Design a protein around this nucleic acid. Structure first.
Lengths: 407, 919, 408
DNA sequence: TAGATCCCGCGCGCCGCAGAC
RNA sequence: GUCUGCGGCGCGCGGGG
């Protein structure tokens, strides 16, 4: 069919995701995949960097925060759904005499990261001089319980890891609605930014069972819409519940009055967003062009420039690339260290390999580069060659990225 | 009652002289065409005590009502007519406020002009918003001027209710205001934006001119060209183009008015306005004087051309309109602009992606066989352990600098060599425009966009070679209609679409995106997305300027009455304003109000960004809009006129029979029920019938059929003369055009050439330009259209005068009639809304009866005696149950649901206390 | 020496209440996390490590390793940080117990459910299978990764019998597969490079020290301690595990885990380098600490480079220029503190004292002179000396300064 | 029917100002 | 002397309300 199956080819192959012959959309969405390949990690890091730049940076009164991956044992209400079994089957009580059986007062792995932000809000209140409008952002990996709901061979609930970026924003209650609408619009812009087909990203409104109104963002995967980013009006009730001893300490200042801030949580899944970007970048029937390529945005592609050499009469002279490669490493431009395999690989094969690898530009150094230095530059978006010059490379690439950053 | 369906009346004597011969003629006519035998379904009878009437008949009643409505303002009009003004003052004052110029030019500061009649004109500068800058008026006593507090230098930040002028005394009585485009002048008057009504009424000279020797559109297309082709030009001297200078020249004998070359108000800044204060004041006073002279020359002529007082009363009433906004207007504008901007950006990205993907066709000369990009140039021209190794060409390389003999073209002089020529042209420069990476500078208007998308059919070049999109586009030198393309070009022929670009066509592609052989096709990724993007964008693309820049004035808290206060919806930092439509009471040869942004046939249509414009017109708290649409207005008027020409029975002509009995659902209605069955398309036959009743011919019908769908000439209305054969079987002789079919058009033709007032109901005269007596001419289609449109206008005037009479007789807090495409709306306080509905129903009972009273009829069918539904809503929309597409949902705004009412409203009376609800 | 806990807690540098962090547990993973400045310092140090190790070597690739271990038929003797290893309700080590049918070995005991990882070497060995294809049979290469590792703690002041606790340490781990020949050469090269890297950002590199150790399992081992005043700690470990660890996994089959080095097929030998980034930040902060309250931290590792403030002057017409300069300096990628919006007119001396406690590289003062001619005052952290400067000439200088910071 | 004409947009030549071979 | 990539005037077409 080629829908979610052909993509998995040239996905595990070019190490954008772990290679275990899974090819299961359910496994990926669940987060039970063994892991992501180096290119997948690089792409996720690029997406996280873009999110940080567009959230913490170009936005005042935003500060970082870190949340622990594990929670303390004591004072832990609730219990695991699968763990709770006491209906029957208690014939063997031969055991002599925390211990116990109701959760054992033991620890618990975190499912959500905004709890740490809520806990650290009290310490971060003094950062903005108790100014009500301000937020804390954090990117972190959370482990969730997932069960296939089929058979009993799986047995205990599986656990899936997923990286999410959560921002908790404290705003005046009066302007909570308009601030939430503006935040939803900004997130929609950001997701539509770096999007090859922005229409696939969609938004919807939802009503909480308590009565709180929120927004849900979905990506239209080939099989169906999947939630990626969720905005919820926390309602401030749980913050008060965490500190019932005295609320006179937590009241922030807005204008010239003191009020308890309203909390909005915007949580986006970097694990599911990256898959959405992968799917969107990939395009089939009566196309007459072929040439499968992952057209990721230049601003968050994993690899920018790939270096190579060709028809070099004196291969020893290839060190012209060396240093230049190092020069490209300065100012944070990622490069694919080619010119090492040196097998008899056809130019078209190498170009296809780089295209499937989502490389913006391909640089080839030839014998005509030592004097009047011109290097053959090929573009991912258009398979067309250029000559250009060495001294114009670095800045140009930076310009390109900069010009990609803002439309 | 009964007798094929009539209503019960409490006014009028027995009458009932139809004639046995008339009965026999009606029966024998209905035997053919339609079927005589139809038991039908009798409707329930309604009994109600109408308010007392005036005079002997209904015509005298309406005449008395209109006279009582107009006399207080006719007095002021006559006072202005008989007044004489001294020469203009030599020097105009500079003080802020209103200054009166007594004789010899003595300037005195006065709070307001205590005058009952003025000729008004206002100047506005486009630099500092739309606030007025200067104004001057003349009364029978002397001149007055207003400087707008322009001289002071202080920021105000717009959004002020005190900024415009002031013309109403505090009063703690009529004050007619005449002007040219007087709606424009009244938009900057203040105290017209108050929710409570205002006693002042306005008169417009363009409305006076459109009624008296107004000009059509086709005729205006030739009146400038001489500032079947053969015709009589004897109408030039009496007609003009409605401009103030031309109108003054036509109606007043004198030198042409000088036109200011600088035009500082429209193209200029505030400094020039201050510098040229005296010249601009003189020009404005000259315009005021010209308007006064035109009004003096026109008022007796108007009264002679429109003898019925109801016409003047309705024209006066229609000049006062009101569109409250309730602070959702600017939010709607912001949402629409954001949707437009992001949709345009996504479209641009899609076109850039298509351009990028198109480059691959040259990698193996694959463009040569592509039917889309075969003709493009596709041209490419060139024209210590580790430290020692670290110091190895660390930064660039030693002597790597190129001598530049080959590299002598920097930046644009060497623009992307190797790339295709078209892609090179699309891309920006390397340095100056920030290089905007990708094939930028691409938009739908570019020729390059075709052949990068769309192109259904076989060949759709759209090349600009005096043919636009070339194609035979039908079955049966080579590649004339074939798919692959690459024609020999021995001789390009414009086959299939023989008319070429000569025929007007329309925006017949946006409708046609739904299949219509207009789609991207092989793309499947971004081609279609651009087409749907254009679909959602096209409305706001060429209308955002008009919808935006609408003058909105926000009242202060103290300005609102107690009705707005003491309501659940109040304050909350609320802004309450209103928009005056700035609508000419007459803008066509027919006296129908013209407005490009409010009087248009548009509604909340999905897959459109700028839709729901009519929505968001939200009444203030404690107020609501009671509205009604006339059920098949023009069709009913034509049918009743035809039957009255035939005999006294309403259903005698077999056309009013269908109108009264036929139903949209499970009925043989001409709209969506009968015309479509004989025709091809469905719901397009409504336009077909509306165009045929207004006058047309076989060529126009054939062209319209081509517009609806693609058929050869034979399948068009060339061999398909059956519709013309039936319906209107004109050009019939040996009978002394009359009858012989289901439609009577003979009465309209007789009215066209009668030379009388020519309006059967209220006797409003036709424009002197189109009078057959004044000039011999053969523009018959314009007159037969005008008679029905003017009948509709007189219907509207009758409703307006009746509604004002009912609202003044009983304490109903409702005013501000708004007319939109024959629909009427009234803003009324909620606690009396039901009354406003009931009275409105009575209007339809009375107005229709007036149309029945004339043309020698005395009964009205029960079906048309009342409005189908009357909507008591809090916003303006096509139907009471509607939603919006571009926003999340109508519930996002405070858009509740209305009440069609109809039958429930009959259970009450019209007195202040109904069913003991009061107190 | 003393009172460093209080000053560290103040200025939002460390997140926690008074005396909660205490002297003990700070080395241990399970202590209240750091402040936003600490997180930024953690983010900058990781970026510097990535620059030094990953990209500058052109042979080291990122790897992904899940925090959890499924542990199918896992051996019954291991770290057992969380034997249950399921979401919520980890039973910790649960030594002994599980004798009855409930919570027994046949399901959910003996670590059949799995465990919580303690190092990234295992993930590197798991990813070797496809990383070998990634490098196209090239044997000498490595995998680097910065990630959280979970460890067990004990003898916490022996206040109450230990029930164990999860200590989270953000460790940077490099696993280098090298041919068995010249493995010692790679070990020595990595040791030297790590020593130079840790000495680069230190104001007093003499504090850092290196030592050698031998183990029966490892051919050679090296350790960096930093020689803390209270005693010799451990800041970095380098070990030559050998090929037997790799041979432990993939027991079946042969000629699959070997690569091509010098056109010769050979089984790789693995070298593991582990550095506690949290320990690395603490040592650097102590090195910065020295007699005013000022910390001399390297410019590249400064969590915040420059800060903006306004002294007296008109309230209006200064926020516009401040916002414009904010936008310009954010566009080029240097973070700036938004200190110009603080109200109440804080004391200038107190402002300077707090800014020095901030460790921000420079303080910018804007007055009406900036409106008149775009001239501002720049104050240095170490010299505490103010100089007049032009508004348009700051940007380049800052990046120029960082170049001087980057260049040795 | 009732069409609407300056206007805005997208192309073109003709006339020059610079500039490396 | 070329041949061009940078400015100002005309001209063709269209669409709109």
């Amino acid at each position: 069919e080629g829908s979610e199956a052909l993509l998995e080819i040239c996905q595990r192959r070019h190490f954008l995701s772990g290679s275990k012959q899974q090819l299961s959309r359910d496994s990926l969405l669940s987060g039970c995949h063994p892991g992501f390949g180096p290119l997948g990690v690089e792409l996720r890091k690029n997406l996280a960097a873009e999110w940080w730049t567009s959230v913490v940076v170009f936005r005042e009164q935003v500060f970082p925060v870190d949340a622990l991956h594990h929670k303390p044992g004591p004072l832990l209400p609730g219990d695991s759904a699968f763990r709770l079994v006491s209906a029957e089957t208690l014939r063997e009580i031969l055991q002599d005499k925390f211990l116990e059986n109701v959760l054992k007062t033991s620890g618990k792995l975190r499912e959500n990261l905004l709890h740490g932000a809520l806990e650290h809000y009290v310490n971060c209140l003094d950062l903005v001089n108790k100014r009500l409008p301000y937020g804390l952002a954090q990117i972190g990996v959370c482990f969730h319980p997932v069960f296939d709901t089929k058979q009993i061979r799986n047995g205990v609930k599986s656990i899936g890891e997923k990286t999410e970026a959560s921002l908790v924003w404290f705003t005046p209650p009066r302007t909570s609605n308009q601030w939430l609408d503006f935040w939803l619009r900004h997130r929609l812009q950001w997701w539509r930014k770096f999007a090859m087909s922005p229409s696939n990203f969609s938004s919807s409104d939802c009503q909480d069972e308590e009565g709180r109104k929120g927004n849900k963002l979905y990506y239209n995967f080939p099989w169906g819409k999947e939630l990626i980013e969720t905005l919820w009006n926390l309602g401030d009730h749980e913050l008060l519940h965490m500190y019932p001893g005295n609320v006179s300490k937590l009241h922030g200042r807005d204008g010239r009055k003191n009020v308890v801030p309203c909390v909005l949580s915007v949580n986006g899944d970097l694990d599911r967003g990256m898959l959405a970007y992968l799917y969107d970048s990939f395009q089939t029937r009566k196309k007459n062009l072929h040439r499968k390529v992952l057209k990721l945005h230049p601003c968050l592609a994993p690899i920018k420039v790939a270096l190579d050499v060709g028809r070099g009469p004196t291969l020893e002279l290839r060190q012209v690339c060396q240093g230049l490669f190092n020069e490209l490493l300065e100012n944070g431009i990622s490069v694919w260290p080619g010119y090492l395999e040196t097998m008899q690989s056809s130019l078209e094969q190498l170009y296809s390999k780089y295209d499937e690898m989502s490389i913006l530009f391909t640089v080839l150094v030839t014998e005509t580069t030592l004097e009047n230095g011109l290097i053959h530059l090929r573009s991912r978006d258009t398979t067309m060659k250029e000559m250009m010059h060495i001294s114009k490379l670095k800045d140009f690439l930076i310009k390109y990225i900069s010009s990609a950053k803002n439309v | 009652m009964l007798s094929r369906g009539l209503h019960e009346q409490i006014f009028g004597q027995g009458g009932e002289m139809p004639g046995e011969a008339a009965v026999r003629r009606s029966v024998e006519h209905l035997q053919k065409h339609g079927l005589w035998g139809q038991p039908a379904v009798p409707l329930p009878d309604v009994e109600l005590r109408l308010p007392p009437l005036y005079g002997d008949n209904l015509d005298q009643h309406f005449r008395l009502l209109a006279q009582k409505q107009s006399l207080p303002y006719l007095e002021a009009a006559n006072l202005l007519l008989q007044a004489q003004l001294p020469p203009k003052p030599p020097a105009w004052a500079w003080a802020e406020g209103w200054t009166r110029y007594g004789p010899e030019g003595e300037a005195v500061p006065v709070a307001i002009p205590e005058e009952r009649a003025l000729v008004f004109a206002v100047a506005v500068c486009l630099a500092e918003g739309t606030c007025p800058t200067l104004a001057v008026a003349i009364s029978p006593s002397a001149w007055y001027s207003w400087c707008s507090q322009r001289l002071v230098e202080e920021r105000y930040s717009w959004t002020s209710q005190l900024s415009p002028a002031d013309l109403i005394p505090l009063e703690v009585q009529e004050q007619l205001v005449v002007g040219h485009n007087v709606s424009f002048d009244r938009a900057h008057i203040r105290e017209q934006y108050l929710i409570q009504g205002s006693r002042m009424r306005f008169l417009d000279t363009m409305s006076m001119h459109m009624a008296i020797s107004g000009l059509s559109s086709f005729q205006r297309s030739l009146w400038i060209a001489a500032k079947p082709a053969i015709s009589s030009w004897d109408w030039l001297d009496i007609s003009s183009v409605n401009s103030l200078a031309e109108v003054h020249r036509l109606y007043v004998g004198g030198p042409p008015l000088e036109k200011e070359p600088r035009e500082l108000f429209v193209k200029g800044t505030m400094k020039d306005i201050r510098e040229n204060f005296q010249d601009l004041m003189q020009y404005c006073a000259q315009d005021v004087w010209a308007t006064h002279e035109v009004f003096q020359q026109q008022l007796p002529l108007f009264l002679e051309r429109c003898p019925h007082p109801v016409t003047l009363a309705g024209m006066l009433e229609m000049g006062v309109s009101y569109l409250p906004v309730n602070q959702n207007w600017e939010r709607y504008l912001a949402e629409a602009q954001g949707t437009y901007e992001e949709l345009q950006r996504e479209m641009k990205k899609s076109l850039m992606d298509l351009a990028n993907d198109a480059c691959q066709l040259l990698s193996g000369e694959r463009y040569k066989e592509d039917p889309w990009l075969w003709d493009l140039e596709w041209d490419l021209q060139e024209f210590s352990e580790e430290e020692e190794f670290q110091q190895d060409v660390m930064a660039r390389a030693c002597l790597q600098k190129l001598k530049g003999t080959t590299e002598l073209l920097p930046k644009r002089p060497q623009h992307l060599p190797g790339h295709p020529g078209w892609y090179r042209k699309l891309c920006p420069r390397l340095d100056d425009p920030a290089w905007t990476p990708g094939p930028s500078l691409l938009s739908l208007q570019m020729r390059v966009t075709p052949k990068l998308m769309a192109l259904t059919w076989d060949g759709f070049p759209l090349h600009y070679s005096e043919r636009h999109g070339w194609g035979y586009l039908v079955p049966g030198p080579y590649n004339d209609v074939d798919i692959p393309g690459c024609w020999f070009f021995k001789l390009p022929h414009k086959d299939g679409n023989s008319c070429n670009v000569g025929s007007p066509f329309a925006k017949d592609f946006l409708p046609k995106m739904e299949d219509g052989t207009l789609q991207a096709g092989p793309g499947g990724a971004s081609g279609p997305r651009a087409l749907e993007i254009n679909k959602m964008i096209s409305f706001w693309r060429n209308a955002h300027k008009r919808i935006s820049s609408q003058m909105v004035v926000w009242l202060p808290r103290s300005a609102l009455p107690r009705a707005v206060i003491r309501h659940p919806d109040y304050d909350e930092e609320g802004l309450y304003g209103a928009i005056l439509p700035q609508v000419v009471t007459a803008g066509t040869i027919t006296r129908r109000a013209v407005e490009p942004t409010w009087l248009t046939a548009s509604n909340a249509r999905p897959d459109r960004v700028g839709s729901e414009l009519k929505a968001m017109v939200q009444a203030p708290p404690g107020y609501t809009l009671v509205g009604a649409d006339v059920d098949s207005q023009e069709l009913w008027i034509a049918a009743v006129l035809g039957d009255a020409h035939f005999a006294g029975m309403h259903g005698c002509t077999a056309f009013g029979w269908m109108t009264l009995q036929g139903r949209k659902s499970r009925g043989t209605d001409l709209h969506s029920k009968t015309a479509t069955t004989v025709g091809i398309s469905r719901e397009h036959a409504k336009i077909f019938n509306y165009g045929r009743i207004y006058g047309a011919g076989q060529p126009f019908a054939e062209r319209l059929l081509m517009q609806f769908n693609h058929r050869l000439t034979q399948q068009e209305a060339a061999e398909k003369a059956q519709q013309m054969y039936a319906a209107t079987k004109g050009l019939r002789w040996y009978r002394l055009k009359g009858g012989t079919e289901s439609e009577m058009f003979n009465k309209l033709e007789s009215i066209a050439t009668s030379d009388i007032p020519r309006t059967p109901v209220l006797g409003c005269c036709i424009s002197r330009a189109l009078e057959p007596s004044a000039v011999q001419e053969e523009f018959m289609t314009s007159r037969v259209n005008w008679v029905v449109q003017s009948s509709a206008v007189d219907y509207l005037h009758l409703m307006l005068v009746a509604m004002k009479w009912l609202f003044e007789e009983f304490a109903i807090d409702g005013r501000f009639c708004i007319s939109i495409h024959d629909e009427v709306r009234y803003l009324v306080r909620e606690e009396d809304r039901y009354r406003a509905a009931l009275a409105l129903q009575i209007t339809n009972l009375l107005t229709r009866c007036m149309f029945a009273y004339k043309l020698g009829l005395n009964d009205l069918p029960q079906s048309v005696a009342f409005f189908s539904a009357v909507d008591i809503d809090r916003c303006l929309r096509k139907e009471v149950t509607m939603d919006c597409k571009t926003p999340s949902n109508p519930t996002g705004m405070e858009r509740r649901y209305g009440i069609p009412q109809g039958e429930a409203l009959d259970i009450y009376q019209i007195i202040e206390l109904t069913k003991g609800s009061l107190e």
